[PDB]
Amino acid sequence: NTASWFTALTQHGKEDLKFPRGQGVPINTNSSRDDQIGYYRRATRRLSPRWYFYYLGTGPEAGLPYGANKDGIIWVATEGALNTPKDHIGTRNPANNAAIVLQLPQGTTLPKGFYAE
Ligand SMILES: [Zn+2]
């Protein structure tokens, strides 16, 4: 029920989403180095699946610890991130804020059949 802060990654292909370690946390300048960790969750349909990012300890799978195994949940973190729930970041209120356009830093390797839109 809680909304992601970011727009989705579209799964235009076959394989499930996955990133190298250290990669895949959306850019968000209203979040600190401590805050750069969480999960993408594949959504159940409204066609190509969409994956949405949530900060660790927020959202549909807030109760999961990092790296926990669940179908349609994959984990990402940046070096420096604290392994704690991001209660102060939370999830987005669509009444107050539009989705942030999901952007990843230069070089980042999106898997085959994924694009930011
Ligand atoms: Zn913070």
Residue numbers in the entry: 48 to 93, 104 to 174
Article sentences:
N plays a major role in RNA genome replication, translation, and packaging and has further been found to interfere with host-integrated stress responses and stress granule formation. The N-NTD possesses a peculiar, hand-like three-dimensional fold, with a β-sheet palm and several flexible loops, arranged as fingers around the central β-sheet. The latter, together with the extraordinarily long basic β-hairpin finger, constitutes the positively charged primary RNA-binding surface.
Compared to the WT, the nat_mutants D63G and P80R appeared to form more distinct complex bands with SL4ext in the EMSAs. Interestingly, in contrast to the other nat_mutants, NMR-derived CSD plots for both mutants revealed more significant changes in comparison to the WT, suggesting a more far-reaching modulation of their fold or plasticity toward complex formation with RNA. We were able to solve the 1.7 Å and 1.9 Å crystal structures for D63G and P80R, respectively. From those, only P80R and D63G exhibit slightly increased affinity for RNA, which likely correlates with an increased positive surface charge that possibly supports RNA engagement. On the protein level, mutations D63G and P80R also impact the gene product of the overlapping shifted open reading frame ORF9b47,48, where they result in T60A and Q77E, respectively.
